[PDB]
Amino acid sequence: FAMQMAYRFNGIGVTQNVLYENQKLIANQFNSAIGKIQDSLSSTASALGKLQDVVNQNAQALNTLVKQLSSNFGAISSVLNDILSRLDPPEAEVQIDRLITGRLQSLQTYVTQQLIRAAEIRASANLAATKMSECVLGQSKRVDFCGKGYHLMSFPQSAPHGVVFLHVTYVPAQEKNFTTAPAICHDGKAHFPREGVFVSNGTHWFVTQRNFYEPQIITTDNTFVSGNCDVVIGIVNNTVYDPLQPELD
Amino acid sequence: FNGLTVLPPLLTDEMIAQYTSALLAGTITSGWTFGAGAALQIPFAMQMAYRFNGIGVTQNVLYENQKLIANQFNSAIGKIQDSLSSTASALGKLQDVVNQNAQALNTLVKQLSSNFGAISSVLNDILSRLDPPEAEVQIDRLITGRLQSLQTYVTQQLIRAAEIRASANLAATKMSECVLGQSKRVDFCGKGY
Amino acid sequence: NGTHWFVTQRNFYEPQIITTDNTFVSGNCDVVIGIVNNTVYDPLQPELD
Amino acid sequence: GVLTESNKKFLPFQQFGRDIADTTDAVRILDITPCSFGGVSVITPGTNTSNQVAVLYQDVNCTEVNVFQTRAGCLIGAEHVNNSYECDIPIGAGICASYSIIAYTMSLGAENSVAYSNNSIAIPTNFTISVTTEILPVSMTKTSVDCTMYICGDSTECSNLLLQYGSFCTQLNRALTGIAVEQDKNTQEVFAQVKQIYKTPPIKDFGGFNFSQILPDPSKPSKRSFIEDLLFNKVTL
Amino acid sequence: CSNLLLQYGSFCTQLNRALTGIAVEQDKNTQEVFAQVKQIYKTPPIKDFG
Ligand SMILES: *[C@@H]1O[C@H](CO)[C@@H](O)[C@H](O)[C@H]1NC(C)=O
Ligand SMILES: *[C@@H]1O[C@H](CO)[C@@H](O)[C@H](O)[C@H]1NC(C)=O
Ligand SMILES: *[C@@H]1O[C@H](CO)[C@@H](O)[C@H](O)[C@H]1NC(C)=O
Ligand SMILES: *[C@@H]1O[C@H](CO)[C@@H](O)[C@H](O)[C@H]1NC(C)=O
Ligand SMILES: *[C@@H]1O[C@H](CO)[C@@H](O)[C@H](O)[C@H]1NC(C)=O
Ligand SMILES: *[C@@H]1O[C@H](CO)[C@@H](O)[C@H](O)[C@H]1NC(C)=O
Ligand SMILES: *[C@@H]1O[C@H](CO)[C@@H](O)[C@H](O)[C@H]1NC(C)=O
Ligand SMILES: *[C@@H]1O[C@H](CO)[C@@H](O)[C@H](O)[C@H]1NC(C)=O
Ligand SMILES: *[C@@H]1O[C@H](CO)[C@@H](O)[C@H](O)[C@H]1NC(C)=O
Ligand SMILES: *[C@@H]1O[C@H](CO)[C@@H](O)[C@H](O)[C@H]1NC(C)=O
Ligand SMILES: *[C@@H]1O[C@H](CO)[C@@H](O)[C@H](O)[C@H]1NC(C)=O
Ligand SMILES: *[C@@H]1O[C@H](CO)[C@@H](O)[C@H](O)[C@H]1NC(C)=O
């Protein structure tokens, strides 16, 4: 699991060493987040509002149909047995006609809303299946599709009529200011980082990664040359370490 | 004036504009960091270089053709301005939705003035004109007709509401992906890379 | 182009001299279909000299 | 209605004047303007916290009839404050209410100005592992309605009368069956992504990560995890 | 007519509930589309974007 978590860190652009230096911290943070979710589910109510809302909508539709079953619809009585036992075949036939028209209209209306709700639930289920496929069976690069931040993974759980996704994600924090430059001028040549960012703490220049502060000395291994210092806007003069001269000398 | 009212939206135009302005400011100043948490300042040239790296172009191309890229972007924005100012029917979807809702409302209003088999379509004439029994049966006919019309209007309104909800979900997905970050999906956020 | 072989990026024409730094070796050249003969620059020999 | 002086010009042969909807607008010259009417809504914070409520008259300028005027109408019974808070009870047109009852303008969010400048960046030096709960409905309760029994209720004459009304009952039954099988298919496609039922190893050594609270528990309450048990106990059927 | 309609049934309540649900749905769509970010950002006074 540590190697898988390191792979997922690589997915969000964070190297493995960041994880392996702070594996215990990451595990503790994950456990604390799980405990916080536990506490929220135990104490805070209405956390399953969508499922409660759809269940209440279905129950309200059923109750409305039941109540509408007890309507006169312009007839003498709302119950069919009394009309059958009280009226002659012609008048009883007319009353039954009125009652059937009313009840059929009500049933058609209920079926129409049931079909609309079924279409909405089908759309929601398709979204849930897409989330399960793209976040539980793999790492999703889509922004805010499976949580706020850089998505790491997701865990599925059942619910009486739904699915609960626990999205584990990476959030940057404890940010610091730095001075940057598009490229570095050395020996009349412009050097751009392979991957990362050029930063300065005030006196010295380093190269690191965008999503984490891991300063490293400027080297020809992590930089590439693509011309001179006359076209890049914002060039900054600095030396570039060559890890070959000390070995030769 | 016949029981039909238009409820004002909760979010007014000014607050929606403020949302869009805040999103644009976050995108220009930070790019995609503000969508994943706290906003992080970036000179927006290195952010554009990062986007070029994402699409598969090295940062040197942008750092050598920044002036050309900026000029092309400004020209494209000006072209969009000219198209929105001169060319009409550029907002056909919103106009179609508005006309659809207006046509539904007008159709309901016109249906409000139908005989439905009655002597007259004016209820007050029937009430001040006729004695309780057959006036009541005529009112019943009018009620059946008007209830049928209002029910079918509500049904089509629900269908259009479902369509609008699907469109809004698509728009929210686009805002989350195209605006708050860089999307690798082909043709999801415009033709090309 | 007509005679000389370079290595570039997929979405832009930025030709560069073929070098062991931007290329990787995997097996012999008797299996790859369509391989061509060309020299590969080693940026260590001039440094030694 | 209300009789008003009319600026409209009526020809000598004209007696009534109708606007759109073919309804009477002017009568010989006085314009007919229906007197003030509209909807009435009640804003309450819940019977538990208090019994105080506010009354909202929408599309009505209640100067004719703690009064506050808004684009959504007018509110009575709630004080208007010049501050801004998160929207608790949405009234409309940017106006919300909360709990005495206070009516205010919804605050869009915290206002900050990022320190943008060239050759300057902000880089994080730490990380947070955040787990967010997201709930998606997968299916709803499957219901079947017997149209003949619902409309009639064990009556042969009603059944004969319904028989020659057409095959509406068959259409409704087919629609309900389609809805039920659609719910079943939705549940299957959501929860049957994998064709193999994998089992965790008896030893749980995941580098310090602890999943015993999301894995099934030894108590075996229908073989549901602790979080799943909480989720099931939170919804009342 | 009001007495006759209340004798007819209770369709009006269902219709009003459907309309209210549609309005709340529209408000939800607007909120989810436009209120994704919880913090309002202001562009700096200096317009230096390269
Ligand atoms: C910047 O970092 C270098 C090495 O990490 C250190 O020698 C120097 O004192 C630092 N300067 C400031 C201003 O922090
Ligand atoms: C930053 O902007 C200032 C003035 O706006 C300019 O003098 C300076 O050269 C710029 N630096 C970079 C790296 O763009
Ligand atoms: C960088 O160095 C070159 C030559 O060493 C010089 O011409 C140029 O002015 C320098 N630039 C700065 C900003 O010091
Ligand atoms: C190909 O490019 C190389 C290097 O620019 C040049 O020496 C050579 O003459 C070119 N050949 C042709 C046919 O253009
Ligand atoms: C391409 O096809 C031709 C035959 O049309 C063949 O002579 C040549 O060797 C092929 N080259 C490669 C690289 O496949
Ligand atoms: C490449 O060189 C080898 C030996 O140096 C030779 O056997 C082979 O035929 C050459 N390739 C071609 C396409 O001629
Ligand atoms: C009001 O809600 C609180 C929730 O903390 C509950 O403890 C209390 O019993 C409720 N009061 C009534 C009268 O229901
Ligand atoms: C309500 O009426 C008053 C005077 O009758 C007027 O000043 C006010 O502007 C009206 N309200 C609106 C929203 O126009
Ligand atoms: C405080 O709110 C009231 C609204 O009742 C407003 O009239 C007043 O101007 C506000 N005070 C300010 C903005 O200083
Ligand atoms: C440094 O960063 C903080 C936020 O991290 C920002 O408010 C400030 O403007 C930056 N610049 C300084 C302190 O010079
Ligand atoms: C990062 O934050 C954690 C707490 O979440 C803290 O224990 C750790 O020391 C921090 N690391 C740094 C380098 O500030
Ligand atoms: C996981 O957490 C639970 C409760 O927090 C605890 O009882 C259990 O021992 C933990 N597992 C491990 C391996 O620490």
Author numbering:
A (entry chain C): 898 to 1146
B (entry chain A): 855 to 1047
C (entry chain A): 1098 to 1146
D (entry chain C): 550 to 577, 584 to 620, 641 to 674, 691 to 828
E (entry chain A): 749 to 798
Which sentences from the paper describe this structure?
Host cell entry is orchestrated by the viral spike protein that, upon binding to ACE2, mediates fusion of the viral membrane with the host membrane. The ectodomain of the heavily glycosylated spike protein forms a trimer where each protomer consists of a core S2 subunit and a distal S1 subunit. In particular, sybody 23 (Sb23) binds to recombinant RBD as well as to the prefusion spike glycoprotein with high affinity and shows very potent neutralization activity.
To understand how Sb23 neutralizes SARS-CoV-2, we determined the cryo-EM structure of spike bound to Sb23. Lastly, a cryo-EM structure of Sb23 bound to the spike reveals that Sb23 binds in the ACE2-binding site on the RBD in both its “up” and “down” conformation and thereby effectively blocks ACE2 binding. In the pool of particles that enabled a high-resolution reconstruction, approximately half of the particles had one RBD “up” (1-up) and the other half a conformation with two RBDs “up” (2-up). A cryo-EM reconstruction of the spike revealed that Sb23 bound two conformations of the spike, one “1-up” and one “2-up” conformation. In both main conformations and for both “up” and “down” spike protomers, Sb23 binds in the inner edge of the ACE2 interaction interface of the RBD thereby effectively hindering ACE2 binding. Interestingly, ACE2 binding to the “up” protomer is hindered in the “1-up” conformation also from Sb23 binding the neighboring “down” protomer. Hence, even if the blockage of ACE2 binding in the “1-up” conformation from two independent sites may contribute significantly to the efficacy in neutralization by Sb23, the interprotomer-medicated blockage is reduced in the “2-up” conformation.
